[PDB]
Each structure stands twice: as C-alpha cells, then as structure tokens.
Swiss-Prot record, chains A, B, C, D, E, F, G, H:
InterPro entries: Polyhedrin. One of its GO terms (cellular component) is viral occlusion body. Component of the virus occlusion bodies, which are large proteinaceous structures, that protect the virus from the outside environment for extended periods until they are ingested by insect larvae. GO terms for molecular function: structural molecule activity. Belongs to the polyhedrin family. The keyword Acetylation does not apply. This is Granulin. Coiled coil: none annotated. Keywords: Viral occlusion body. Transmembrane segments: none annotated.
C-alpha cells in the first residue's frame, strides 16, 4: 500500500541551518501523539492478555494436503438431516490409506502428520435461496450398528460462514499412515490394517441438514485434510554418483 | 489510582434542608447515563457470550516452577532452522527427573503437577536488528533416528511477541516425576526409568530459525516449566514434640 | 433494566485449562478503560466539589402531608396579577389548625413538623394555549391593611416548570400546631390562638398572573404542605391487655 | 503539571527575518480556535448564571476546629435506627463549653464563631460489606421527654458519600461560648449556663441506621465542628517590655 | 436570532398531490431524532431533579435599588486586609435611613423591602496587573470595641468573578426603614432610631485584601442594595378632582 | 414516550430566595445550546427549501377505499414477465363500476373521487427465497390487439420495498363512477357505459416478473384503490320526522 | 468578541454561606478539564518546537513603504511568459533613487532600510476566468545582453494566493539610498550613482505568465517595497526657539 | 513510558495448536487499522511535503557556548524602548575576543564557529504583572553617531514566548575569533583587531521595551552565544611519552 514506506520527506542545509519537510515534521508530531495513546492503552491490553485465542489450524503451522474422497447430492427436508457416509471401519481405513499414499508417493522427506481432519464442504444447487447448513456426527459404534439414513435435527453444529466444517479425527481413535516423525518404509494396506487394534469400530458417521423451512438440494464434497510438518535438510539433490 | 475511592463529596444539613457536593451529584448523573448505556449493550454482550477464550496458563491457576536446563548459541542462515537439542529419550528423562527433584526437595506438601512445558526463550546477540523468531518441533521417533542438524523452513510456528515459546509435553507421552495428587515417597532415577513404558521413544526435538534475510546469532535458554497445584493444610508447623 | 445484573458469562475447565466467556472478558477490558477515565476525571470532580446543591424538600427527607384548602378560578389580564386569598391572620390560623388537626388525628406517634409550605398549584382552563405562570406574595401587614385585588406585574417570581409554587412559611412568623418533637396533648383552637403572640399580623397574601399577552382563565388549588418526621418505636401494637 | 508554564518555544532573527518555534505557532492557532469557541458559549453560560450554588462550608471560608466528643459502637437491625446520644440540655451545654474552651485556650486573637456543627462520622466494622448510612434527628423537646432508643426508618436523611453528616446547630437555639466578634473575658461554666435562656430545652437527639438488609455493626465518632474567623492584627509579638 | 421562527418552507397542491419544502421535511426528521433523544435523557434528568439551585438574587425577583454610600482608596500589603468602614451602629443607621429615604421619596406605592445587602465593588488602579480580591467581615461587637485597621489574611472569602461581593444584612439584626408590606407614614430619623432595640451593636465591619504577592492599590465603592417588591394597583392616576 | 411532557422539575421559595430543580436548569442550558445550533443551520435549510418532495398519496389527504378484484398465481421464468389481466375495455368498466358501486352504496354524503389507482400486491409462495419484483404495463391499444401472455424483461419498473405497486389511472382516459363533487343520482351500468366515449380502448394490461435467476411462484392480489374526499355537513341525523 | 471578558458571574454571602454563579462554576470545571488536556499535549508541542517558521516580512517588524513605479498590460499565450521590464542598470538605479527620495523627503528621523523588495501585483482583465499566475526572473547580466521579450515556461515560480509576488533585492547586489542606521545628508543622483561599484550589471528582469490553456490579458502593477525601521527619540517638537 | 516495549503477550502450543495472547491479537488488528489509515493520509502528507520548516538553531546541530557579558536593569515607559548597550566597535570587539578566548582556552580540538548570536534575555522585576517584551536593533552606523538613549516604539520585534531573543551576527559584518575549520595558533587582541577591516563600524545597538500600559522594571542579561562544531579524532590521550 504505502508507496514511500515511512521515508517521506527530506532534509537540506542552508547557511548552517537545517531544513526538513513540513509533512515529515507533522508526521513526527502525529506519531508522538499516537504513542502517548499506546502508553495509555498498555494497562488495558494487560487485562486482555490474561486470555488467549487459538490460531486457525488451516491458516497456521504445517502444510495442508486435501485428499478429496467423493462427491454426493442430498435433498434434505426441513428440521431433518441426511447421512453423508455409511462405510464400515475397514472401508474407511482402505480409503484413508489408499488415497493418501497413492496421492503423496514418492514421499521424499522426513515428515509427521500433525492432525487428520474430516472435511465437509457444502454448496447450494439453486440460486436465490437463503439458509445456512447444519451438521451432526458420531465417530464409533458397534460394527453391526447401521446408522439411520435420516434423523431429526436436535441441537446440531451450525456450519461456519464459508460452508465448510472440519472435524478432527484424533490419533487416539483413528489410524494414520505415518505415525511419528519418520522416513517411509516399505508398506501395504494389509500390513497397515493388521496393526490397527480396532479396525471395525472407528468410522465417521456424518449428517448434514439446513436451517431452511423448505426442502433444499445440497452438493457435498468430502475430503480428508492432512496437516503435515516436513523436515527437509538444507542440502543439494545431486544426480548420481554425487561428486 | 483513584485517591478518594468513589467516596467523593459529602453532605450537610442547614435548617432541615440537605446539601450535597455538586461534583458528587454530577457523578450520580453521569453514572445513571453510563448504565443506561450498559443496559443498551447487554444484548450485544450476549451474542459475544456464545464464545469463550482460554486463560493464559502461566498467568493463570497453579504455580510456575521454571527448571532451567541449559544455554546455547546458534547462528542461523535465512530460511533455515537449526536443531536445539538432540538427546536420547533416556537422557531427556534423566535431566527431567534429576533437575526437578534436586531443585524441589524437600517437597513438604501434597501436590500435583498439572502440566509440563518445554520452554524456548530466545534473544538477539546484536543490537539494531529487526526480525522475529520461528520454531518447529517433533516429540517422538525411532530411537536410531538421528535428527538433521539443519532444515529448511516450511510453515513454521511463529514465536510470540515476547520471544518465548512453550510447548506442552502431555502426560500421554512424557513421564512426570509426580503423577497424581500425592505425597512424595522414597524414589530414585532407576525406579522412575524402569516404570516408564517407552523411555527411548519420546524426546523433544526442537528447531529455531528467524524471519531475517541475513544470518542472525541467537542466544537460547531452554527450560522445563512445571505448573503445580499444592494442597497445604491450614495447620501450624511445630517444633517436635508438638504440644 | 439489566437482566443479568453484572453476572454475564461463565467459566469452565478443560484439561486443566480455564475458559471464560468472550463477552465477559470484553466487558472486563471495557471496564478497565472506563476506570482509567474515572481516574482522569477525579481531579476535575474535586474542583466541582468546592460547591453544593440543595436537595428538593418534597422529594427529600421527611414525609409530605398535603392539606388541601380550597379551589378558585381567576381571569387575569396581561401584565397584571389577581389576589388569591385575603384572610385575616385569625382566619388563616383557624384554617391551618382546624384542617391539619382534623385530617391527621389520631396522631399516634411522636413527631415534629419540619416545615410548613404554602402551595399554589395552577392549571389552564382552555386547551391550545401557550404561556407560563407568575406569582408575587407578602406575609405580613397592618391588620387594617386590605390588599389590592389586582396589581401590575413588576419583577415577579416565575412559577416552576410543573406549574406549582411552594412558599416556606417560617416558624419565625407562622404558628405550627406541633412545635417541637412531641406527643400530642389535649388541645383546641382557643388554646392555640391564645398562645400565638401576633395572631392578626402574619397571613399569606398571594397573587397569580401569567406571561400571556391575552386574558387567561386559571384554575387554582391552594394547599398547606406539612413536612413531618416521625419517631415510631420498633415495637408491637397489642390488643389490651398486653401479654 | 505544565513544566514550561505557557512559555513554550522561542524566537530569533536571521537577516532581519524573525523566526518563531513551530509548536508555539500551532498553539497560537489552537488558542484562537478555543476562544472562538468560548465566545460561542458565552450566551449559554449567561443562562446558567441565572442560578447559584453554595460553597462547601468546610472547604470554604473560616477555619475548622473539630472538637471530638466521644466514640460509640451500635449494632443496627435493618429498617431501624438507634439513638446515638441522649444527654439533657445541661449535659450537652457542659460538654460544648468545657471541651471547646479547654481545647482552645489560650485564645490569643479576636475572633467570631461563624457556625457550630454536630458531626456524625460513621465506619463499618466488617470488611466485604456493601451498604450506605442513614440519619434522623431532633433538636428540642420537653425536658422530661426521653427519646426512644430504637425507631423505624421513615424518610431519613441519606448520609453523604464520605460517610460524614454535619448538622448545623443554629445560634437561634444553641448557645455558643463566643457570641460575636470579641476578645475573651474571664469566664466559667456557671456564668455561661446562667445566661442561657432555655438550657434544658435544646439538645441534639440523633439516630443512625443503614440501607442494609442485614444487621450491621457501626463505629461512630461524634464531634462538634466550630467554623471560626480570626482578626489577627499585622503586628509583632515582642517579649516584654516592648522596645 | 432565527429569522423564519420555525416557519421555514411551505406547501402546495398539484393534481390532488401535496408538495412540501424539502428543508422543512428534513427538519421534521431531525426533530423526531432530537426527541427520541430527549426521551432517552428523561430518566437521567430525573436523577438530577433530586437537587435544586438558587436563583441569583440580583437577577431574580424584586427590583434592585442601589444606594451608593461612599468611595475609598486602599493600598493593601500582600497577605493582609485593610478595614473599609469603622462607623458606630448609630452612624450606620443614620446613613442607612437618610440615604434610602432621601433617594426614594416620594414613595408612592405599597411595597416591602425583601432584603438589604452590603455591596463591596472593587477595581484595580493600575493596568497590566493580575490578581483577585478577598474579603472578611463581622456584623456586631461591643460598642467600645474598635476594629484593627489591618489584619492578616486567614481563610477569607474570595470575591466573585466580577469583583463584587454582596453581604446579606438580615432583618434579624439590621433595622430596615420599611418593615413589612406597607404604605409610608410620616417618619424621621429620631423616631426610627428610638424604635431600634440595639442601635449601637450591629454595624458591618468589612475588610478587603488581594491574592497578590505585591502591594496593590484598590478603588472601593460601597453601596447598600435594597431588593423591593411593589404592589401597584392596576388603576389610573388622575389630576384632581377625579371624574 | 416522554412521561413528564417537558414539565420536569419545580420551584419553591425560601427566605425570599427562589430555588429551581437542577435538572430543569441543566435542560434550559442544553436547550439554549440546541437553539444556537438551529440558528446556525437555518441558512442551510434555506438552500434545501429551494426544492420540494411529494406527500405519499396513500398516507396523505383523502380516504382510501380498496376494492379488491381478484387473486391469481403465476409461475414466472427468469428474465421474463407474465400477463396479469387481459380484459376488454368493457369488462374492465363493468368490474370498475359494479364492484365500487356495490361495495359503497348507500353513498350518503357528497364526495369526489380524487384518483383511481390500479394496485398490484405480490407475495412469494415459497420461504427462504431472496429476490425482488418487477412490473410493466400499458393502458390502451386497438381493441383487436391481444397482449402476449409472456414477454422478456426490458427496463422494467422495480416494485417498491413492500411489494406493492400502484398505477394511477387518469381521469383523462379512465371513466370514474363519480365524476366531480356530487350527490349520487339514480344510475346503472348501461347508463354509465353509454356515456363513456371510448369504452373499448382503455384497459390496464399489466405484467409481473422478478429479479430471480430461477423460476418463482408468485401470489398476486389485484385491487382498485379509490382516493375519496367527503363533504359531510356538521349536522345531526334524526329519525323522521325531524323535530 | 467576548462581552464579559472572563468576568462572568458573581458571588454573595447569606448567613455566613458563600454563593457563586452556577455558570461561573461550570466554567471553572471546564477550564480544569481544558488544562488537564494542555498538560497532556505539552510533550507533543515539544517535538514540534524542534522546528521554526518565518514571520511574514510584510506583516512583521518594520514599516512598509510602497513606492509604486508603473503599470503595464500584457497578453500572454499559454505556456509562455512575457517580459515585464527591460531597463538598464542605470535606469533602474535612477528610478529607485528618484522615486524613493522624492516620495519620502523630508526624512526627519534616523532610520535604516532593512530590505528592498521588487513587488509584482497581477490582476485579470476579464471576469469569469479561472487560472493562476506564474513568474520567472533574473537579477544580473552582461550590459549588452538584451532579454528575450517572450520565453517558454520551464519550472516557474507559482505566484501566491493573493496574486502578489515580492522578490528580495539583496544589499549585496542592489544599491539602497540609505545604507545603515543614519541621518540624511545632502545628496543627489550623481553622487549616488558614482559610488555604486557595478551600476550597469544589476537590474531585475522579470517575466509573467499563467497556468491558462488560453491567452489571458493581465494588468500588472510594479512597485518597490522598502521595509524601514525608525529610531524616533521620545522628545517634543518645538517651534523655534525652544524654551 | 511503555513498559513492555511492544512485546506484550506470548504464545504456546497445545496438541499441535498454537495459542496467542488475546491482547496481542487485538493490537495486531488495531495496528492493521492504523496503517490502512496511514496509507489513506500518505497523499495528503505529499502536499505538505512541498514545503519545509527550519530546525531551531539552539536545539539543533552544533554545540552551544553561552559567553555571558553583563547584566543591567532598565525602567521603560509605555510605548518606548531604552538602549541596552552603546559600545564603540572596538569595545565590542574587545569584549567578544577577550571573553570568548578567556573562557574557552585551552582549545584542544579542531573546530569551527558556525554562527555568533547576540542573546537578550529578559525577566520582570515585579510579580503579578502581565505584559510581553519587544525589541529593536541596528548593527552599524557612523562611528561618531551616538544612539538615542530612548526611542518610541514603531513596528518592533515581539520577543518570543520564553522572553529570549537571539540576533544572528553575520560573519559578513562581525569578526569571529576562529574563522574556518582550524587549530588555534598563537594570538592576541592586537593581532585580531588589526586584521579586522572595519573595526569601528559594526556594533550591536539594541533596544528593549514592553507591551505594557504602565512603566515596567526589567532585568536584562546580555550574552554572546557561539554555535560550534568540533572535529575530535577517535584517538586516545596519552601521558607523554606515548607508547
């Protein structure tokens, strides 16, 4: 924005006397003002600094890897929600492992998956409508429990302003293809699945509805968002043999 | 600040008639004003009260015990970060246990460690520089994984305004010398280490860099910060024998 | 007005960390602000506190007893005032004593008359007029001095905004039916009148006019307003015999 | 406060040309502004100057002489008031005369007592309470009238913000040890008492209560405050013989 | 000021449709605004209306009659005050009676003296000085008490902003030439003086000083200001014989 | 709103001195302020008063008589408009005359129809939609010209904020059942129709559309709104015979 | 402007109590406010007081003597400037000396010419035009150098807002008829010219143009403005012989 | 002033999530605001930067050496000015050379006198006066011209706000003891005086007066203020012999 930075004005010397730009001097007076004011607000900011806010995970540290999974259209009656996905725990693990590993290999750097998120992105399929989205979910159940395809709305999560909701899938329940800080090793889905303690228990069961008083047609995009921190050494890549 | 509290002014009685300080009365009128305004803002505050902020852990409940561990100087190239510590899990446990227990004994009260934090405090070693600090970390890896001494910066954590970063070391991974609410018992490092399930896996591997476009020389102080709540009974300490 | 008092918001604890309502915290910051401001105004209020205002006698201490005396209509020419009352001192004393004592007995508590006021309450007898009221008075004269029924206006008292004027009748000149703090005794008008030193000298002679440039028809209500302080003991009233 | 008074800036002369400090000139422009504003507010101040306020007697003319009399603790039930003092008129006169004359002699200058005040100063005897004080009084009664020790609250005086109430004791009723502008003469209590017309009638009977809904314990300090104007000649005091 | 009163704008009719001046309509909208604001301030004004101010006696009811008495120059040392007048009570009564009656006769209307004021008006006798005036007074003393010509300043009255001070001389102490509401009768000074109970006791003894740190030369004008209410009947004055 | 009108505060008289409520006096000062401001804005309002606005016909002079005619549902494609009515001039005249005369008789007072309006009132038939209405019209055509049932939108009238549009039907083209100021006479439709010069030419042909990008279902209410001024004499209605 | 100076309001004394005008007291509170503000701005003014501005020579010290020389009309094409004067150095000296000495004699006081200015005053010769003036000049050249009558505009001086430009003619180059502080002596042009070292070199060559995009007709007034300081003794002028 | 610099607040990491102080974040939002504002004011500052102000010579570059010369009291009539100094040119040169050289030797560094100022510092000799100072001067005259001791005021210089005036004495007229950048050489007054071309012509003749309408007594301090720039090499001073 600023096109002079804060280097407005100049100085010169005439018969030993120093002259300085008038606008520069008026800025110095205004800046002294502004800072008498910052000194008066400092004790107020100290009361506010008793508390803290959380940095947005997707604008904050680590990189974002969006592994889109599928798209789906649902028509949802007012005051109800429709089920988005009904996979078994095994089918959820197969999609998690296969889609991430196929998209990311070759994984050429040491890295760690910080977090795994279930991302629900929603959009209207008609123009000139006014309503917002709602969501409800569960993450585990008996493997012979089959979720109802449609439920009534009861104290749901209200989807945020950009019509995206992201649900953290904790490493406590959900298995990650890269556990800690590591290099990749030779791996395959059967190895991965065998080493999961409860493969059939954990699976996201997610419902979507609206705040509309009429039926609305919704386009849904479902993704898994991986937050990743890489440890790339500050070294060259050479064609072999090196040196 | 206020040197009359809110007890400005006085009253007196002359021929049955009550007189009151003019400034006191003007304050009563201004205070009625101010409160007609607080009643107009109440519904607005109710929308804000749908949400909550988190109290700063180090200004909030529990006491702070800073067990400083070591100091170190690093010279860091632009867009890179240098490794601060490379201990094995055993060496990290030995420093954790030995430095806390040696500093704190005698532990004369029942107490609980609420949280253990890794504290990185940073300062410039040259004057007249302008830049900020960055950080990256991992908490676990294969015990024969040795971390790169220098990495490239990729979506790092930006260190906060006072140049301190504090990383929570969860009781899920890291072993505490005082587990729950307890008295101390006879203990030693070999007892402690034996009872840790994965002593060689968990260890903080922490990197520091800057936002500078030149190399900068940084002084680092590394500490473990223990948050502790004590349960001291409301009773006298007597010289023996009591009574 | 305020429906949460100042108890907006709440707190809760999650993994040792304390959360507090956002609106509550923003109020704490605004309240710190407001008080940095009250500390800056304190020296100003101290200059104002060199002076004092008088509490309104009729909204202030003591109770009000309005002994209405009579009503009267007067039609008043512009720039003139008409006489409201022309009693002798004896007739004024007879109305004062008889109307107060008849209205108030039984006087069952120890009490003192703080002040006696002559109250002139005025109202227009036509709608869609715009003007204000004026007043003039005297409190004593030769007993064979008969007041002019109509006078010209000359530097009058301007009646206050609610069209009531109240003139203090000092105990220095006017005789009260209850002198000091006392119980009632057996009494009668002839006893009272005999003990007044100058019964025929003191009598309110009160004139009313307007600021109108046309003749106006005015309804007048004249009352005596007694300000009284009671000393009722904190004790039961029992049916006899007690206990 | 101001550390340059209003003498900020300076002037100098260069080749016949006069230079003046920029901040001084900007102040001259701001002061011209401010005064165009005072000229616009003058007609408004003229409407306010139709009325007057009273100077605080204790911050205003004459000196204050606080003759403290006694201290007392009272425990007061809600909606009631307890009697502070129950002296006869003689005992009140003995304390007035004896305490003032003993405290003030030698009275070495011509002087006049402007006013005599009864001062009630009140303080809580418990912390963490919130309430205000109330007062009621009478100044005269039959000498065989003994005041109730406790009364119910009925339209009391509300004590001012600094928890002091001061009641004027008029020279009309209460006898002063120094009547007019005078030198002292030889005097004694029996001379003083004999020359009082109604020694047994006038005595302050003062009650204190609170606005609390619980019983409160109150510490009371009672004083007589004399306002005095002295006429000290502008002359030396010499050791005798003079000159 | 306003040259259209509040009758700005007009209306006209075109094809049944009513047109109105745009500025008039914008005033109606602004006036609706202003009054939503007066309704919001009404409860605040109700807190202020617990108290009252006193109308300036000299701008308020009754007419002013300034009987100037004398002029005098005094040179006053810093921190001192010089005596303005030293009359006996008789000489003060002779000037009061003679100067008022000579100035006012013929007194052709029924009237009452509301108040008698001692007026001290002060002015500097040098230009380019900056200081304010002070005052002290007594109203009675032993007739063989002669006031000190110069006293030290001790908690004086500070003279008001227009350099005039006016001291009320109560009818309690000072004798008025017209007592109550009356016509004049034949009278003379010897009649008046004989009927005064204490002619030699009451006399104003008034001192003037400054807030200057140097000697200042002051011109003093002393007056008696009579506040008078007249009762002139609304009748013609005819040349005799009438009708 | 205001519960004291502008009669806040009061006045009283104490020892000749006039006291007035403090809030009343502060209002007088604020009102002087406000009016110094109205005098400063007067020249600005005079520039605005060069122009005029038109009073809303339906909130302004004359009474409203809404003769509702019919209801209709239309489903309208985006960027198009559908025809609301397609009557011949005769059928429009028959509905105008018959519906007004049947609704209004007995017409017991002298009166005049000021204006006749075609009123189109529109409402959505689905919730949670966002769009506005548009309109287009013609008032005359060849009698064998049949209007297109659907047209494309081209610079339409945008319907006002409350979704009502009212089109004036001038007496120049459209025949009114009551011409001038008159009493009713015996009349019938055939008399009325015969006296219309061009009965088949003038007829409202009105189209409705939206600003939506999807098809919308609209409920339409069509009315004729008569603006009428009555001349009712200020006289009694008596049962016959009168007197 | 202010018609009470700052002496608004007054004071008076009633029963020892001091009353003061309400508007005066509100001014004292506002003035305390204003000065808490001047104390807060003082450090800001101190930053501004690092710099200085120059007093306008013609509104500042010394008196102005405008020796008008000639008038001239020029018609100037856009982006060009026309020569105002083309005198030799001798002719410029003859006009300088002759016009000043003829206008000013008798020079009856000791005085010094502080500065000599060349004044160019410009005005349009047509109404309803909008443009500003420009100027360019030289002060010396070879005596056989004849200036171009018309030049193109190239980075000119923009004439100030009142259409006057004043060019200082330094005593370094231009000869003054009064050198230092002196009395006049007998003198003549030939004496003056002989004592000038370089009479033919220094001469003002001044051009005028506009910022118009059309030809403009300009009236020019050229003057020499002398700034003079006089040393008139504080003594009488007597008719001879004195005393 | 600011006690946290701009390092308010901190950061910490909990389960990969970054927390930051709330007050720090609110400052970041306010600082973004403030700078959107600085970008909006930049084009305005560019218009102001067409012009320049002069740095105060005495707060600016070079050091100040105040060689006080003498003190003097003058009593000055209104509208007049009195002569402060009347030295010949030789006596002025003797004081200039002798007082500077005696005060400054040993002059141990290479240096240059930038400017020589005549400093007039003025103070009142009475308190409680209000007026400002004026000045007039000349710098040269015939050596047998003796200045009038008192002159009338005519367009004087108004002394600046701190009652100091400083007149630049140009190197063009006045001889400096150190001409250019130099070391000192052996020198004496007779050498200095001989090398001055016009020793008897140049001498400051300075007058002081006031804006008072009365005579005022003024204390005057006269100084010569030398502005000096030194060229001290960055080298040690050793005791001899060095090394």
């Amino acid at each position: 924005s600023l096109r002079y930075s804060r280097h407005d004005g100049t100085s010169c010397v005439i018969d030993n006397h120093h002259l300085k730009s008038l606008g520069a001097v008026l800025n110095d007076v205004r800046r002294k003002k502004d800072r008498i004011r910052e000194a008066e607000y400092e004790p107020i900011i100290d009361i506010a600094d008793q508390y803290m806010v959380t940095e947005d995970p997707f604008r904050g540290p680590g990189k974002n890897v969006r592994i889109t999974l599928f798209k789906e259209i649902r028509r949802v009656h007012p005051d109800t929600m429709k089920l988005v996905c009904n996979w078994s725990g095994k089918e959820f693990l197969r999609e998690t492992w296969t889609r991430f590993i196929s998209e990311e290999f070759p994984i050429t750097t040491d890295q760690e998956i910080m977090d795994l998120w279930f991302e629900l992105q929603l959009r209207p399929m008609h123009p000139n409508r006014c309503y917002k989205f709602t969501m409800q979910y569960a993450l585990g159940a008996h493997p012979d429990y089959v979720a109802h395809d449609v439920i009534r709305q009861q104290d749901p999560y209200y989807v945020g302003p950009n019509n995206i909701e992201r649900i953290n899938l904790s490493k406590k329940g959900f298995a990650f293809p890269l556990t800690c800080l590591q290099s990749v090793y030779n791996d395959n889905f059967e190895r991965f699945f065998d080493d999961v303690l409860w493969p059939y228990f954990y699976r996201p069961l997610v419902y979507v509805g609206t705040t509309s008083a009429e039926i609305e047609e919704i386009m849904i995009e479902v993704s898994l968002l991986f937050k990743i921190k890489e440890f790339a050494p500050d070294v060259p890549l050479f064609t072999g043999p090196a040196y």
